[PDB]
Amino acid sequence: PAARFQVQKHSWDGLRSIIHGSRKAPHDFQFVQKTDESGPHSHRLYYLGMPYGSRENSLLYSEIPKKVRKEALLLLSWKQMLDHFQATPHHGVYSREEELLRERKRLGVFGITSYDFHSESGLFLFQASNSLFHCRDGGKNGFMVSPMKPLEIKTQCSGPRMDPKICPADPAFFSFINNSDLWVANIETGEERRLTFCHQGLSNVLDDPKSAGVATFVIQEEFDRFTGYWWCPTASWEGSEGLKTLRILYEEVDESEVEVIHVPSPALEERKTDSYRYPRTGSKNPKIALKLAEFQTDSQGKIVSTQEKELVQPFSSLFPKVEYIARAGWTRDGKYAWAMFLDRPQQWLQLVLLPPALFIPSTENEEQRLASARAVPRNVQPYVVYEEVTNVWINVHDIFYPFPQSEGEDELCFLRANECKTGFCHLYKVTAVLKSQGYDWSEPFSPGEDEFKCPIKEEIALTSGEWEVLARHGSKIWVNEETKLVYFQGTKDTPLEHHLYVVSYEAAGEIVRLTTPGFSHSCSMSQNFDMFVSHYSSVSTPPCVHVYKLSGPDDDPLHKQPRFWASMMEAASCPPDYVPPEIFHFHTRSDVRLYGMIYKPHALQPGKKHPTVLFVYGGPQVQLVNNSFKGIKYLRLNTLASLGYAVVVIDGRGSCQRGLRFEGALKNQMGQVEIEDQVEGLQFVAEKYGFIDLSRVAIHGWAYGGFLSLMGLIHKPQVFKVAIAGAPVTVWMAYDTGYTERYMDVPENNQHGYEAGSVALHVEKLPNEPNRLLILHGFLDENVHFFHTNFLVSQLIRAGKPYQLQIYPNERHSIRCPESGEHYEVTLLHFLQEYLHH
């Protein structure tokens, strides 16, 4: 039979030398057309980027030429917008507000990480150096040819100005959040005005529990929403004085009843915590309402008045089953505000139109409030234009595109991504009928079943089949109303690649792929539908960023050619010591297709079985196995393979980009099906490849992966010789409402699932042998609290079980510091060297 390969033993400092030795793209695109026929450029393309000489992200541009040589590859020059400007604060130490927002968004890079852009005026608005800055380019002032100094926006406000946005109707104005309230300011005059008065500014913060315009913890962490306010895109002219009204839809929250937890602050020497309103599963979420903030401006841009407006009947009366606002915004004409509402079980979503006339001025005067309520026209109401229901869960999809209405039309046509209908996320063209029932809004009423529900006149599937339109985590559609085409991203070719597609929403038929097969693409489309960018890679090829021109006859828009135009970034040379993993698939005993990757031992010899690391995440919303470059994020897996470890990765049931039924397998039973699929995958790899030593398998993962590493050691102790569990969830009753309830229900409704899935309650089944269990955790983790590890250790002590522990005192949910990253990898190599070998 096969010989058993022995990894070379190194000293601790030898392992440090291996790790240190081993560690020896433009984004956020805005296309602007140039309208000078004499000049050689069709567009200026703006973006964020860190070029190789820079140590932070800054605002950059490249010039797109009208003509390119067919025989040559143009590499576009990256031009600086800002002149020798440091956007990063001193020592990369952000305010707590900016630091936590960077954690919620998974932003690791320093400098400008987002900007707001107003195309007509050419205004850029962004956070930098613990303040707000702006610059102008294009519009009236024209296009810069060397970097300019950005202008700081002065304030009399105390503490950070968060979530800055330009007023779409009038770019003289921008909005921001300060001390949990919504403000506006005139960028030209410097005038600032507070719009909302939720935050009293009391000495005891726990007595001051309301905010306006703020996405709370669970909304940011579990619903991917980082804003609590939405500019109305249009101005209005109500009243006799001729003042211009500007409007902001905002979420008001009351966190009074939300549980408070303390997490250590990153300034360790101060030995203090930050307080979080952390809704643990089964406990109270914030009380929420949508409100309308208005202010009026004169011809000189002076802010003459402000008004808080609220729903004529309470949010809780109109929409009694709503737990969460997933998303909100406006129709392009500003005729309707809209909101995406979820029930607490997250099995029922409503898309609701809210006309501004349904909101009345807030007042303590009961007679004035009654007068305002009585004056609301009878034909004004909410319209539930769409409803999604499932026995699995609603994934929040960002795709909702309302078409403009004609005058006197009692219908709304819109594009909607819908997963629950077929179990795969697809594009539908929906026509809802908006008919007024007639309501006396001064008279309180409890709405009945389907009270505001709109009849659906038409619902056309634009896409169908066992593949997904991508509608989450930055994915969007682009709609050309001139050509009646919708551009979208999807897995139609393969679940291993993201591609750009186009289909008609008028005459739904042929879907045209616009991206190159054999790569996974992240695309940005011009609002003029003339050009697009793709950031793309493969398992073998590092990322490149290419600009494409949509070319061909204007009478055949569906079959426009994606013509390669220029490169923004050529693929880096694949290092000689880097060997890409190999993708495979197999069918389980239940005949489900699973995909996996194998990092083959480097310089592999036949007839030899190698010690193996099963690298696991295995949780919802993640797919580890796809045809994209893994060497930037997962270099440590190549390093393991270079020492002669085989590394196996399996996307089991519960993982994403395979439809709702596939991820639905773990419903109310997290931990159970995932480990079965991991073991089937490992055993398939051993049978297919023949270089896996099944007597020497380590299971290793972080967060959900740490949870499954422990589940593996508990339930399959003959399969897994050692577990290395990073930031593990050890008790589901300690995780939050938004995530845990979606997949597991509330604890009272799923006692068996919570008990079976909580590894800290099964410590009696963990090994009675030392050196089979290494626990790792960031001390400052505000997501999977250090509590999870602390509670697991308390249980290990009670059960008389041995454990090894490493803490990252300066790290939250991920290891960001390179020295801590290296120490983690050295520790992993040492643990495997000493304890995976017999």
Place this chain on the structure above:
Amino acid sequence: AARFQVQKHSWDGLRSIIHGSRKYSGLIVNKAPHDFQFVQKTDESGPHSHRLYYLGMPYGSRENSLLYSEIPKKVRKEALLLLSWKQMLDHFQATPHHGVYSREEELLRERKRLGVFGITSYDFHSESGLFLFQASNSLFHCRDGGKNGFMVSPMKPLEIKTQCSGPRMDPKICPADPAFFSFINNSDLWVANIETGEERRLTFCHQGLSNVLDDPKSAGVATFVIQEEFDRFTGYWWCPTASWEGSEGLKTLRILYEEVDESEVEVIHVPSPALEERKTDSYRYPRTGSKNPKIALKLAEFQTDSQGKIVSTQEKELVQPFSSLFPKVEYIARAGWTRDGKYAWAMFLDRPQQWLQLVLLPPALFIPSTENEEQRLASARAVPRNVQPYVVYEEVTNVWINVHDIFYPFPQSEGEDELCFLRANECKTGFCHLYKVTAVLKSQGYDWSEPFSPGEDEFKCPIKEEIALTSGEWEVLARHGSKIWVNEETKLVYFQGTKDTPLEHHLYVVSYEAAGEIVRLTTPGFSHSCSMSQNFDMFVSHYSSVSTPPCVHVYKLSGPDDDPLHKQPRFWASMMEAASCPPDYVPPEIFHFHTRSDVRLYGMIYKPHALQPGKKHPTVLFVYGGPQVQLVNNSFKGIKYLRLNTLASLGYAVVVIDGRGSCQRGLRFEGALKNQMGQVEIEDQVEGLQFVAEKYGFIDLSRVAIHGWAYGGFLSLMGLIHKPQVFKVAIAGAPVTVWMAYDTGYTERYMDVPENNQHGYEAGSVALHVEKLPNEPNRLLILHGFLDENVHFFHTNFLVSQLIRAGKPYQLQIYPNERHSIRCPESGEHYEVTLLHFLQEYLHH
């Protein structure tokens, strides 16, 4: 010579060894009765001379209760009387539900090192026979002796009803009138009438604001550093006498209290023991070099009528601010009253803790607190010219002041301008000794309405006489419960000391009239903890040796009344017989040697069990090595240090050395570590280890582990840093890793402020020397209680941060539910199993 190899066990094998060692220890923890009060019986016919009251956990109970035993007038000389433990309280549970105390009571128990459940203290008023104590999240009382007579069976204790919100802490009976008691509620001083139920708030420092950090004043409360570093758990003191000033038949009662303002004190967060709530408690933690609380002594007065109704109250403050009168005072160590109530007194320390003043404060120096400037000026002008503070004693040193509790003022004659007192003083000779001091109290007059700036030696009293009652190169014990008993009829002072040997505490008596012969009252070959009857006819000794578990014996002082100094201690009865020395337990052997500098150091050795000649054994150097502790003495170590016997039973040699810095050897000996903590301690540990190896011949110097907790964890790391060829492995429990993160009271005493001793702080902070820790794995195990509010988990967290930056390996264990010490048996067992496993795998080659 052959190398002994310890038998390798499985993890579950080690669990069975540790579980067996503790379950079948042959000893009981928290067994001894304590807090003794002797009361004479007044029945000449009856068979008992005294009732003896105490706290004790009787066999067939899981908590401390209030107990008594009857002391017979006659005992048989040839028989051993075992006193029957009688319950005072009828089937009463004093422990709260699931042994979960309020945060206030829990932290007080941590400061006091109280592990036992139930009644942990009582206040007793002997004349009235009133007992006052905390139990079951409330206040209870009972009565026995005096007028009510002596109970023959247990009685139900009476709860004291309140309309206060939150705990009533630090309850005390009014000495002048036992109808009244005091307590602290929400950081303010209250009094109550126990007979009528009437309650009255005296101080109004605590506003009760929603934001606690905007509410930084307390009255009657000892703050964190005072409790943790000065062994003071109260911030108020009853005046022992009533007065009758004013214009009605009203009686005035008085309480001296410390008012503190913690506004400028740094706030830190420590995790709460309810881990599932994921919250912290806020502490006003003065780190070394940062602000201590602003402090003042004030006087609370109230008047009572003939019905015991509280008619009126007054807050009074010093006529000139505390900060003006006493500008160099950082800390109030101690306070109280003269027995006649004529003076309040305070023990003041400067911030360097090198200057102590004993200061008398007459009540007339305190005036009513007021916002009305005209009323305040009138009050200040009315203070008599001859009223002033008196500095009756001053202690100065170039080492540090240890706070000694022994101050006994003799009551003054009317019109006497002198005060006589007994005082324990260490700084005079470098050894703690008893002095009879006479100070002259004369005033040359002050205008208290005029703004005040004290000169050098303002208020300083001439010393007429200072008699040394004790002398030599040994100590009177004056700290951590040690006290004197003064019989004014016989002119004798009873005290404890190290006169016979630094290895044993003994009870002594000497005359304070004609200072001469010191008589020892306790048996040599044991260390004694004694309680004396207030009638000086009987005493209790709680005593043990290295070889004999503790017993508690009652002794009668007998002989001719005309020769009180030579009264003979006669064994009378047993409160608790010594358990048999367990067959599996082998006592350690005490030795001494002289260093190369000719300092005598004491040590102990646990020999490997069933030792064979010509065999070198792996060795554990068990270390504390910090100030205020002596590990090596002739007392039983098997209750607290059973794990050292367990190590010896597997064939480890265990060595303990009391190096320079350790206590019970005088100020010069402990003063060696001044401004250089870490440096001399390791030199003495290594000399001790090397002496033991040369003398005993069974030490394998190639296989030595260093292990300690707290200061011992600090020294374990210092050993591995500075002597990496001596120490193969270090196991550091709850280590201090950065002195700049420890508190004012302790750190500044031994090290000065960071700004004045940058080199000492740098050299003594092991977290700043991680580059010198081993680059090899399995040489360093760190252990820490997650909830430690003393040596914060931060010390370990910061050490780990530095280890990561330096690219060093480490092993780590946390005790999620433990503070500064491991109290839970499951955690204690897990710690010992982990230690055995670490030594088994990594001390062997």
